[PDB]
Every structure is written in C-alpha cells, then in structure tokens.
Amino acid sequence: MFAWWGRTVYQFRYIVIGVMVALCLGGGVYGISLGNHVTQSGFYDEGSQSVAASLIGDEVYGRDRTSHVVAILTPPDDKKVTDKAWQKKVTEELDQVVKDHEDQIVGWVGWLKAPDTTDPTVSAMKTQDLRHTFISIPLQGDDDDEILKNYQVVEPELQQVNGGDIRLAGLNPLASELTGTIGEDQKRAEVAAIPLVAVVLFFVFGTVIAAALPAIIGGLAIAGALGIMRLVAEFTPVHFFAQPVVTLIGLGIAIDYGLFIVSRFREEIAEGYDTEAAVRRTVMTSGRTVVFSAVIIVASSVPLLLFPQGFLKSITYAIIASVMLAAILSITVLAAALAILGPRVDALGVTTLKTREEVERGFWGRLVNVVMKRPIAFAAPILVVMVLLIIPLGQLSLGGISEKYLPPDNAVRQSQEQFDKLFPGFRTEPLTLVMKREDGEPITDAQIADMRAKALTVSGFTDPDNDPEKMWKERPANDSGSKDPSVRVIQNGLENRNDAAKKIDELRALQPPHGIEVFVGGTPALEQDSIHSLFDKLPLMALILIVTTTVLMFLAFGSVVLPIKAALMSALTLGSTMGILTWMFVDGHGSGLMNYTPQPLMAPMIGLIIAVIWGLSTDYEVFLVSRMVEARERGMSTAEAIRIGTATTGRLITGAALILAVVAGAFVFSDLVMMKYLAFGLLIALLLDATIIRMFLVPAVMKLLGDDCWWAPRWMKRVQEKLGLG
C-alpha cells in the first residue's frame, strides 16, 4: 500500500507534480476572495433558549440600531455645547456624511438634532459641565455582517466631521477594530515570521533546494486550503477567525511534514540507495508517519463538531482542510518533486543566495544514556512540577466578548470606556423575558403585571428609578418589528454580572402566567447558555478524543502500551499548558509585559485550545516514537531502540518546533487578546513537548517500561496488518 505508492509516485511523477501544483495555484486564486465571503457570528448557542429569545424579540419588536455607532462630540477651544456657530457647523457636517451615504447610514439621531428638547433621555446625551455630547448613528444592513461593511464605508469620512476629533465607539467601531487585527497579525507573519522560518529551514538542510521544498509544500497548502474554505462558504458560512488558524497552525505543520519527507529522502541517499529506492522507502516510513500524523489531528479536531458554536465548526473545517492537504502534498508533490531532481536536493548550496550533524547526532546519543541509566531521577521531578502547574486551573472564569479584548491603550477601547464614564446608564445588557402566547391573543396588561410581579421576586435586578414599579420596562419597539399580540417582552439589567449564572436559572424557575411561555434571553443569557453547553459536551468530546488518538497510534506504532503512555503524557502537557494560561490570562501574571488586560477566558476558546494542544503534542509523540518503533523492528533492544530513535530525530524535531514557534510567536503580539491566548497556548505546549517531554520524560518512562514498550496482543497486531498498515 505505502510500498505500492512508493513506486507509483515515480512511474507517473511528472503528472503527479503537474496536476497537484495546478490545483493548489488554481484553488489559490479562487481562495483570494475568501476575505469577502466570511462572517463574524457563531459564538452563542444557536439552539439555546436565549437565542430563540433574541431571535423572537427581533421579529416582534425592532432590531436595536441605536447601539450601532456612538460618536462623542467635543467643541474646540474649551467652548461649551451651546455655541450656535459650532452646532450649525457640525450638524451641517453630520448631515453631509449621511447625505453622501444614504445606502450605508439610515441617519443620525442625537441631542444636536433638538438642542432645546424636553425629553429626558435626549437630555442625558449631554453631560453636566457641557463640553461633551454624543449622538447615535444607526446603520443599514440585514445581518450583523452588512452593518459592519457599511460602517467601514462611512468610517473614513465620518471620522473627519468635528475636524478630526470624534470618539467613535459602540458595536461597529469595536467590531471593525477587533476583526482588523487579522490584517495586522497576518502581515506581521509575512514580514517577521516567513523570513525567520527560512533561516530555520536552511539551518537544518544546508542547501537551497532542500530548504525551499518544504516552503513550497507549505505554500501550496495555504493556497489550497483557502480555496476549499472559499468553497465551503458557498453553503454554510465560515468565520473570520478561520483564516488565521490556517496561517497559524496549517502553515507551520505543512512545512513540518515537508521537513521529514525531504530529510528521510536525503538520509536514504546518504546510505547508498538510488533515487527510486528512497522515494519508495520514504513513503513507507516518513510518508506513513506523516499520513498517520494528519489523521491524528483530524481525530482530535472533529469532536469539536459536537459543540454548537458556529465559530468552532468553521475552524475545524479550516484545520482539516489544511492538515489533510498538507499530508497529501507531501506524498504527492514533495514525493515527485524529490523524485524529479533526485540527489540535486543538495545541488545549489549556501553559495547561491556533515561534521556539524554528527556532533549533533553524538550529543543526542549522550543525553539519553544519562536519562536511561537513571530514569526515576528524571521522571519524578518532572511529574510533580507538571502537576503543580495545573493548580491555577481552579480559577477558570468564563466571560464574553467585550471591548477589553484590545490593548488597554487602544484608540477605540479608550473611546468606548470614555463613553461609559461620561454617559453612565446608557450601555446596558438586560435579561429579557420573551413571553409568548400560543393563542395568538393579546397578553392582558394584568398578565404582564403578573409576570412582572414574579420577576420582582428575584433580588439583584437593577432598579435605578428607586421604584420597584418602574422595573422590567417593556422593550422599546422600532418600526421594523411587527408586534404579534401574543409576544410581549420585558427586560431588566443585573446588579452584578457574576450573578447572571444564578438569576437566569431563577427567571426560568418563575412559573409563567398560564398560557404563556417565557424565553429568557439577553446577552448575559446568551453567554451563560453558551458556557453551559460547552461543559455538558466537553466530557463526551474528551472521551471521543482520547479513544480515537490512542487507536490511531496503535495503528501507527505496533504496540498498545505506547499509545497509552502517549495519552498519559499528552494529558499531562494539556493540564500544565492550560494551568499557565489561566495563571497568565485570568490571573494576569505577565499582562503589562505583553500589553493585555486580564479577564475571563472566552468559553469556546477553551474547547478549541484542548483539541489543538492534544493532537499537536500527540503528533510530536508519533514523530519521535515511530523512529524508536522502527529501530525495534530491525532487531534491537529497548534501550538501543530508544537511543537510536531519539538521536536520529533530535535535529528534525528541534527544527520542526522552531518553524511552528516562529509563526505562533508572530501571533503572540496580537492586539486581540484571545489570539494572544491561543498563540501562547501553542508555545507553552510546544516548548514543553520538544524539551521536557521528548528529552527526559519519554526516555525515562520507556526505559522504566523496558521491553513492554512494544507489546501488543496477538489478535490486535493482526487487525493492524489486515488494514494494510503492517
């Protein structure tokens, strides 16, 4: 099978590179337009009750457009907000902005439209000492995606009204700033990471042709994966965050796969085999490991499909479509591309821009004997430090998307927090009570006052009027909503957003008036319903994740003790990495150094970081142990097999982890916080596997385990062979 494709990729090697580089570059120009056909929704549970409350409340009442954009106006030269020459100037300029964009802006509403008003809520749009006043600029669009693209059309000219000084805040000035970090991070990876991965790719192969062939494989994968994600958008939507997690994870692993196929080809050439022999022998060993590695990532990422978050579903498609395409490109393009030029992998050399590898192979031979000869002295201090690193995980707070995902010194984050200080009380996240009747009959004003009465039993709901009768005010209705007599929602905020987990349960516990069914929604209910759905399905994901990666390793290796030693070791790296991230992102240790603000972690990010760490650390255990397993099949003792595998791999795995840490290191400088969280989640897990796990834990435990490392029952070794994996 793998042996068959060894020479089959050589008999037709010219077509194999011809069609595959054509599809990747073909799908590359198609995937250019992915940046347009991509959404931003998918963080809340689309099937929960709070979403139904939020979707029903938008049909009956009106979709809230007041919170789209808020601009804070300030008169120059310490003038107060009563100057008629300034009001006649900036109102003339705002009307000019709306007149120039009648398709994007519906019009602006503010205290400046009626300077001599009596409406209290329009009077609160101007502060006490004057000097400051804000407006609301509602925007056009059906879904949350049109409104953003409409905001980014008017934002340039809108920014120039007062002269240059308007603090644009609200939903869209933040959403444009949050999604705008993707351009910053990916550009940072182009100018500062893709050069650094060219140094590492060269300081492991010594030649131009050798160093550049993984970059060709990595480049085609991105060009190929963006085409498939562009095609997926033609049916179900794909999220904004799915594009970085290809540039981030896929680009770094596609080169890694290209680093073992090019290297094992160079190894079999240095042993004396001909070109067709090595091409036939790499795909039975390295090509077999690359394919097994890719299927282990898919095994780790598909349990995320059990989660209802759309944003997580779009990402696992980006992870599968960039990893499986990275393995295919390796035993296809890179197999043929190496078969075409043969030994000319080492032709070009450094000058067109052995003794160092043997002293490197020698150093790795020395260290493992030190570990094998005294195993418990290494396997015991490491065991406790790792368990000690899982202590901070007990402080796991889960919060929602907010303005504090930017650096604390950000332009828009300060424009937003300035708004909350100047005009308190306008920004609210109430819990809505979407009560509907199946009769299609008007809810009596008594039932409303009766449902409002039961809602008044729960303590901790903001009563700012100092009057328990002006609470649970009916939600204001816009013209765009058609009011069925059956649906009438009431809503009131909370005193502490931490109580939301508690009071949403009490609001559902309130016995509704007879005939009516009350959906509890609001953004605090949208969050606490998405948090709970994660933890109900996280155990089932954990089970499917562990049994699939372990079985896939038993087929990759030949044993059953190594697939369990791996999972035990791979659960240790998970516990330590998430403990540190909780410690440095929830408890904020090291925030001022990286410019972030400590805050609760986003709930779906917890599910993604698990499936990405486990499944990347496991791919490194297959990278390493598969060489020890191959040495055992040549008739070598356990300590001889351990020493041989880990020594002939200490430069490929060390060079592979640098390419991945350079790309992920170019994303730790993200202005978006949860990208820093994921980027650090890679380095901490990655650096822990390539040093503490590879060099000290797996040799000491495999030495302790001895000749039991390779054992597997009789019938199980037959199943692995009958699947053509012998």
Strand-pair partners of 489: 434
Nearest to 491 by CA among 50, 14, 2, 10: 50
Is 44 labelled a binding residue? yes
Q: Which residue has the tokens 């938008």?
A: 58
Q: Please give the structure tokens belonging to residue 652.
A: 């490929």
Distances (CA, A) of 591 to 407, 584, 605: 10, 7, 19
Give the DSSP H or E segment for 73.
Answer: strand 70-73
Tell me: is residue 619 an annotated ligand-binding position.
yes
* Residue among 575, 603, 626 at smallest CA distance from 264: 626
Q: What φ, ψ does residue 707 adopt, rounded to 5°?
A: -70, 0
How far is the C-alpha of 69 from the C-alpha of 88, rounded, in Å? 22
Residue 510, exposed/middle/buried by CB under 10 A (0-12, 13-18, 19+)? middle
400 is in an annotated binding site: no
Beta-ladder partners of 437? 516
Q: Identify residue 300 by its one-letter amino acid code.
A: S
Question: Please, are residues 660 and 253 in contact by the beta-carbon 8 Å criterion?
Answer: yes
Phi, psi values for residue 46, rounded to 5°: -65, -10
CB 678 within 8 A of CB 608: yes
CA–CA dist 42, 633 (Å, integer): 49
* Cα distance between residue 219 and residue 215, in whole Å: 6
Task: List, edge to edge, every strand of the sheet that includes 109-110.
Answer: 109-110, 133-136, 70-73, 166-169
Residue with tokens 């077999």: 288
Distance CA 158, CA 71 (A): 9
Encoded amino acid at 401, one letter: I
Q: Are 283 and 9 in contact (CB under 8 A)?
A: yes
| Residue 723, phi then psi, degrees to nearest 5 | -85, 10
Q: Which residues contact 224 (CB under 8 A, 6 or more apart)?
A: 23, 24, 27, 28, 31, 322, 325, 329
Burial profile 156-195: b = 16 or more Cβ within 10 angstroms, e = fewer:
eebeebbeeebbbbbbbbbbbbbbebbeebbebbeeebbe
DSSP label at residue 561: S
Helix (H) or strand (E) holding 267: helix 251-270
Residue 480 in marked binding region = no
The Cα 676–Cα 106 span in angstroms is 37
**Tokens 């994303």 sit on residue:** 667
Residues 6+ apart with CB under 8 A from 628: 641, 642, 644, 645, 646, 702, 709
Tell me whether strands 398-399 and 516-521 are parallel, antiparallel or unpaired. Answer: unpaired
- Vertex 385, ends 381 and 389: CA angle to 5°? 170
In the 8-state DSSP scheme, what is residue 672? S
Residue 151 annotated as binding? no
∠ CA 494-526-589, rounded to 5°: 80
Q: Provide the β-strand partners of residue 434.
A: 489, 519
Distances (CA, A) of 444 to 432, 436, 449, 485, 591: 18, 12, 9, 10, 54
Dihedral of alpha carbons 632, 636, 637, 643, sign: negative
SS3 433: strand
Residue 458, H or E segment: none
227 is in an annotated binding site: no
How many CA atoms, within 13 angstroms, populate the side-chain half-sphere of residue 215?
A: 17
Look up tokens 């010594």; give the residue. Answer: 206
3-state secondary structure at position 109: strand
Pairing state between β 601-602 and 398-399: parallel
